[PDB]
Paper text:
pmcGalectins are a family of proteins that bind β-d-galactopyranoside-containing glycoconjugates through their canonical carbohydrate recognition domains (CRDs). Galectin-8 is a divalent galectin found in the liver, the kidney, the cardiac muscle, the lung, and the brain. Galectin-8 is a carbohydrate-binding protein that plays a crucial role in tumor progression and metastasis, antibacterial autophagy, modulation of the immune system, and bone remodeling. However, there are major differences between the two CRDs, such as the presence of Arg45, Arg59, Tyr141, and Gln47 in the N-terminal CRD (galectin-8N) and the presence of Ser255, Asn257, and Asn348 in the C-terminal CRD (galectin-8C).
Galectin-8N was first cocrystallized with lactose, and then the ligands were soaked into galectin-8N-lactose crystals, followed by collection of X-ray diffraction data at 1.52 and 2.1 Å resolution for the galectin-8N–6a complex and galectin-8N–9 complex, respectively. Both complexes showed that the O4 and O6 of the d-galactal portion bind to galectin-8N in a similar manner as the corresponding oxygens in the d-galactosides. Namely, the O4 of the d-galactal is involved in a hydrogen-bonding network with Arg45, Arg69, and His65. Further, the O6 of the d-galactal engages in hydrogen bonding interactions with Asn79 and Glu89, while the O3 engages in a hydrogen bonding interaction with Arg45. As for the galectin-8N–9 complex, the quinoline ring is placed in a favorable position to establish an interaction with Arg45 while the carboxylate moiety establishes a water-mediated hydrogen bond with Gln47 and Arg45. The endocyclic double bond of the d-galactal moiety in both complexes is placed in proximity to the guanidinium side chains of Arg45 and Arg69. Compounds 6a, 6c, and 9 had nearly identical Kd values for galectin-8N, with compound 6c exhibiting the highest gain in binding affinity compared to its galactoside equivalent with a Kd of 46 μM.
Numbering used by the authors: 7 to 156
The structure:
Protein backbone atom coordinates (compact mmCIF):
# COMPACT_ATOMS: atom_id res chain seq x y z
CA UNK A 1 0.00 0.00 0.00
CA UNK A 2 3.10 2.31 -0.15
CA UNK A 3 2.94 4.82 -3.10
CA UNK A 4 6.23 6.87 -3.43
CA UNK A 5 5.78 10.45 -4.79
CA UNK A 6 9.64 10.62 -5.36
CA UNK A 7 13.15 9.05 -5.23
CA UNK A 8 16.50 10.92 -4.70
CA UNK A 9 14.89 14.41 -4.60
CA UNK A 10 17.31 17.39 -4.70
CA UNK A 11 17.28 19.09 -1.23
CA UNK A 12 15.52 21.32 -0.48
CA UNK A 13 12.47 19.33 -1.73
CA UNK A 14 8.89 20.78 -1.64
CA UNK A 15 6.07 18.50 -2.97
CA UNK A 16 2.22 18.43 -3.02
CA UNK A 17 0.75 15.55 -0.93
CA UNK A 18 -1.52 13.67 -3.38
CA UNK A 19 -4.35 12.77 -0.88
CA UNK A 20 -5.73 13.93 2.53
CA UNK A 21 -3.69 12.97 5.68
CA UNK A 22 -6.61 10.97 7.18
CA UNK A 23 -6.24 9.08 10.50
CA UNK A 24 -4.27 5.87 9.70
CA UNK A 25 -2.18 7.49 6.88
CA UNK A 26 1.62 6.65 6.92
CA UNK A 27 4.41 8.96 5.62
CA UNK A 28 7.63 6.91 5.01
CA UNK A 29 10.98 8.74 4.43
CA UNK A 30 14.23 6.78 3.74
CA UNK A 31 17.56 8.68 3.83
CA UNK A 32 21.10 9.25 5.25
CA UNK A 33 22.70 12.06 7.41
CA UNK A 34 25.94 13.44 5.89
CA UNK A 35 29.03 13.47 8.26
CA UNK A 36 29.11 17.33 8.38
CA UNK A 37 25.33 17.70 9.18
CA UNK A 38 24.16 20.08 12.01
CA UNK A 39 20.34 19.75 11.46
CA UNK A 40 17.63 18.86 8.87
CA UNK A 41 13.82 19.14 8.96
CA UNK A 42 10.66 17.45 7.63
CA UNK A 43 7.82 20.06 7.52
CA UNK A 44 4.16 19.14 6.92
CA UNK A 45 2.91 22.51 5.60
CA UNK A 46 -0.42 24.18 4.85
CA UNK A 47 0.72 25.37 1.35
CA UNK A 48 4.22 26.16 -0.13
CA UNK A 49 4.44 29.98 0.19
CA UNK A 50 8.09 31.02 0.92
CA UNK A 51 7.08 34.68 1.63
CA UNK A 52 5.25 34.96 3.92
CA UNK A 53 6.30 31.44 5.09
CA UNK A 54 3.58 28.68 4.88
CA UNK A 55 2.16 27.45 8.24
CA UNK A 56 3.98 24.25 9.39
CA UNK A 57 1.57 21.91 11.26
CA UNK A 58 4.50 19.57 12.05
CA UNK A 59 8.23 20.57 12.14
CA UNK A 60 10.31 17.41 12.76
CA UNK A 61 13.88 18.82 13.19
CA UNK A 62 16.72 16.41 14.19
CA UNK A 63 19.76 18.38 15.60
CA UNK A 64 23.28 16.82 15.87
CA UNK A 65 25.44 19.15 18.12
CA UNK A 66 26.54 17.62 21.47
CA UNK A 67 24.56 14.40 22.32
CA UNK A 68 21.89 15.35 19.69
CA UNK A 69 18.09 15.77 19.97
CA UNK A 70 14.87 16.26 17.90
CA UNK A 71 12.91 19.55 18.13
CA UNK A 72 9.22 19.39 17.07
CA UNK A 73 7.11 22.57 16.84
CA UNK A 74 4.36 24.41 14.84
CA UNK A 75 4.63 27.68 12.79
CA UNK A 76 1.33 29.72 12.60
CA UNK A 77 1.52 33.18 10.85
CA UNK A 78 5.35 32.95 11.06
CA UNK A 79 5.45 32.42 14.90
CA UNK A 80 6.87 29.17 16.45
CA UNK A 81 4.90 27.71 19.46
CA UNK A 82 6.37 25.89 22.51
CA UNK A 83 9.22 23.52 21.38
CA UNK A 84 8.72 19.80 22.17
CA UNK A 85 12.25 18.38 22.50
CA UNK A 86 13.16 14.66 22.56
CA UNK A 87 16.74 14.14 23.91
CA UNK A 88 16.59 10.40 22.94
CA UNK A 89 17.56 10.61 19.19
CA UNK A 90 18.33 7.54 17.00
CA UNK A 91 19.78 9.88 14.26
CA UNK A 92 23.57 10.12 13.79
CA UNK A 93 25.92 11.72 11.25
CA UNK A 94 26.83 9.17 8.51
CA UNK A 95 23.91 6.82 9.40
CA UNK A 96 20.91 5.83 7.20
CA UNK A 97 17.34 5.97 8.60
CA UNK A 98 13.72 5.03 7.91
CA UNK A 99 11.29 7.65 9.37
CA UNK A 100 7.66 6.45 9.68
CA UNK A 101 5.10 9.16 10.57
CA UNK A 102 1.67 7.66 11.51
CA UNK A 103 -1.20 10.27 11.40
CA UNK A 104 -3.71 9.55 14.25
CA UNK A 105 -6.89 11.45 15.18
CA UNK A 106 -5.18 13.64 17.82
CA UNK A 107 -1.40 13.34 17.06
CA UNK A 108 1.52 12.16 14.89
CA UNK A 109 3.36 9.01 16.03
CA UNK A 110 6.95 8.83 14.69
CA UNK A 111 9.08 5.64 14.62
CA UNK A 112 12.65 5.50 13.17
CA UNK A 113 14.33 2.22 12.08
CA UNK A 114 11.29 0.31 13.50
CA UNK A 115 11.45 1.83 17.05
CA UNK A 116 9.02 4.35 18.68
CA UNK A 117 10.64 7.83 18.79
CA UNK A 118 7.94 10.43 19.75
CA UNK A 119 4.33 11.71 19.74
CA UNK A 120 3.19 15.25 18.81
CA UNK A 121 -0.40 16.47 19.36
CA UNK A 122 -2.02 18.24 16.39
CA UNK A 123 -2.12 22.06 16.87
CA UNK A 124 -3.37 22.61 13.26
CA UNK A 125 -6.03 20.27 11.83
CA UNK A 126 -4.02 17.70 9.78
CA UNK A 127 -6.68 17.89 7.00
CA UNK A 128 -5.14 21.40 6.32
CA UNK A 129 -1.69 19.84 5.43
CA UNK A 130 -1.29 19.64 1.56
CA UNK A 131 2.53 20.02 1.20
CA UNK A 132 5.68 18.20 2.40
CA UNK A 133 9.09 20.01 2.67
CA UNK A 134 12.57 18.59 3.49
CA UNK A 135 15.35 21.20 4.19
CA UNK A 136 18.95 21.19 5.57
CA UNK A 137 21.91 18.69 5.45
CA UNK A 138 20.26 15.35 4.57
CA UNK A 139 20.13 12.87 1.62
CA UNK A 140 16.66 11.40 0.86
CA UNK A 141 16.43 8.05 -1.00
CA UNK A 142 12.54 8.06 -1.00
CA UNK A 143 9.32 9.74 0.25
CA UNK A 144 6.04 7.76 0.09
CA UNK A 145 2.47 7.60 1.46
CA UNK A 146 0.21 4.78 2.61
CA UNK A 147 -3.23 6.48 2.38
CA UNK A 148 -6.48 5.54 4.18
CA UNK A 149 -8.14 6.55 0.80
CA UNK A 150 -6.93 3.27 -0.99
O1 LIG B 1 19.54 23.64 7.58
C1 LIG B 1 19.16 24.34 6.64
O2 LIG B 1 19.88 24.49 5.52
C2 LIG B 1 17.87 25.00 6.81
C3 LIG B 1 16.92 25.15 5.79
C4 LIG B 1 15.70 25.80 6.03
C5 LIG B 1 15.50 26.26 7.34
C6 LIG B 1 14.35 26.89 7.73
C7 LIG B 1 14.24 27.30 9.07
C8 LIG B 1 15.25 27.13 10.00
C9 LIG B 1 15.05 27.61 11.41
O3 LIG B 1 14.46 26.56 12.19
C10 LIG B 1 13.89 27.05 13.41
C11 LIG B 1 14.91 27.67 14.35
C12 LIG B 1 14.76 27.60 15.67
O4 LIG B 1 13.66 26.86 16.26
C13 LIG B 1 12.64 26.35 15.41
C14 LIG B 1 11.95 25.23 16.15
O5 LIG B 1 11.16 25.83 17.14
C15 LIG B 1 13.20 25.87 14.08
O6 LIG B 1 14.05 24.70 14.17
N1 LIG B 1 16.41 26.51 9.68
C16 LIG B 1 16.56 26.07 8.41
C17 LIG B 1 17.72 25.43 8.11
CL1 LIG C 1 -5.04 9.82 18.81
Amino acid sequence: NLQNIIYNPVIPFVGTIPDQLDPGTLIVIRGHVPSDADRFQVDLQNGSSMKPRADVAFHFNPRFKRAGCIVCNTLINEKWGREEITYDTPFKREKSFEIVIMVLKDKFQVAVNGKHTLLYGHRIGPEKIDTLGIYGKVNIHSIGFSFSSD
